[PDB]
Structure formats: structure tokens, C-alpha cells
Amino acid sequence: QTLVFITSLTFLPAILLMMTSFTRIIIVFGLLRNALGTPSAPPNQVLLGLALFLTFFIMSPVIDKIYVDAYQPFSEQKISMQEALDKGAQPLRAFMLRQTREADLALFARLANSGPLQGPEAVPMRILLPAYVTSELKTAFQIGFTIFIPFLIIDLVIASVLMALGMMMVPPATIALPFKLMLFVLVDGWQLLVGSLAQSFYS
């Protein structure tokens, strides 16, 4: 039984981190690292830790509501998780329904051949999750691609200047990297980035 057990080692925690956040923040930082030259920040520890810390920050009120409403009577273990799920899904759902764009909801309600819903809370979870994740991908890319442009402009300017002199055989990616560090720490570029990512998220 090496197969069935071991596949769920990453499956379940990844799904639990797909529900709420940590799906767009990784992507923003990964796009940053795709810019800014080479990796220059090891994913295996640094980006994962950072993007998990920011999520534990942003979702603090959510975990607080869960802790009070469901976690605390779960210390009694009153009921198997039925309202624990529900009274814990409702903060999760209300947090999720706030970020899911409109088109995605309608589309994935069509693809399931569902019936007309009267309330938003009536939207089943198996319909919400993929719409939420799709919306989050299509906003994470909307932020990330808007982050690049200055970096690519510096790249283009440096390359044009180098070729203006006669230096064909230089890898201008190696002269770019320092300027793309000074124009990152010089505009306080990290604080702006994280304040944006933490504000624009909930709003």
C-alpha cells in the first residue's frame, strides 16, 4: 500500500491550502522570481515560508471565527463534524464568495447542470471551489503581469544601450540584475508589494 497512502501526503494539505488563499500569493512571488533574473530566492524554503506566513496573517480573523465557533466546542467533541464543518464552512464560504467573480459561478453552475439557486449560501461547495480557484488564477496573473513591465523596460533599455556601443557579445541579463535590485529596494518595493497584496485581497 505504498501508493494509496503516500499520494495523500501532499494531496490533502495542498487542497486545504487551495480552499482559501496561498494559491495567488505563490504565483505573484513566482512571477517576481521569473522576472528579476535567475531564481535568486530558493523556492524550497523561502517563498513557501513567506507565502505561508502572509496567509496566516491575512486569514487571521477567519481562523479566529473558526476557533471560537467550531474549534472550541470540538474540544468537547460534541458532534462529529457536521456543524463543525458547516459553522466552519460558512466563514470559509463567506470569505470565498466575496472573491469569486461572477462569470465563473455562472459557468460552473452550467457545467454541472444545476438547478436555480435562491441564496448564495445554497451554492454547493463542489461548485464553489473550482470557480474560486479559477478566479484567483485569473487575478493573480492580472497582478503579476502588471508587475513585470518596469523590469522588462529596464531590460530593453540596458540591451539597447549596450548594443548602441558595439558590445554584441555581452549577456545583458548579467548587467540588468543589479539595477533591478536597486530599483527594488530603492522604492521600498517590497513593502508596497506586500501592502498591496494584503489590501487588494480582502478590500
Partner: protein, 89 residues
Amino acid sequence: MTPESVMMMGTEAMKVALALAAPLLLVALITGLIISILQAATQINEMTLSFIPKIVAVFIAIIVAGPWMLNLLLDYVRTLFSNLPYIIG
């Protein structure tokens, strides 16, 4: 997120890039032409005789221009990072 905004992004990007790069490149071309005229008329020309002044000119012009070439990027990256939460909405 209307295709007018997406194209305005590019129209601003390329204008900033031109504003940055055009002074340097124009100094390079100016030095090139000034020496190339002296290159003929007293015909002497080996091959370059001019890449060295094309380095002197850029090295001077970068120090002379300096501050506002920084200020452009500083302003525009700041406005970008500030408007990011409203691009989405």
C-alpha cells in the same frame, strides 16, 4: 480591466522607455556623426577611432543626466504599485 486600460499600460511603458533611453542613444549617435565627419575630410580612418569617444560620451551623459532618469522610474513604479488594487477593481 478594459482593453483600453491594457493598451494604455503599454502606451505608457513604451513612452517611459523612450524617455529613459533616448538621451544616451542620441549622445552616442551625435558623437558618432561628429567624429565620422572628421573621419573623412582628412580621410584617415582605421576602423573605429570612435568607439572610445562613444564610451566617453555615454559615461559623461549618464552622470550629467542622473537624477531625473531615476525620478521617472521612481514615480512610475510607485504609481503602478499604488494603483494595483484598483486595476483589479
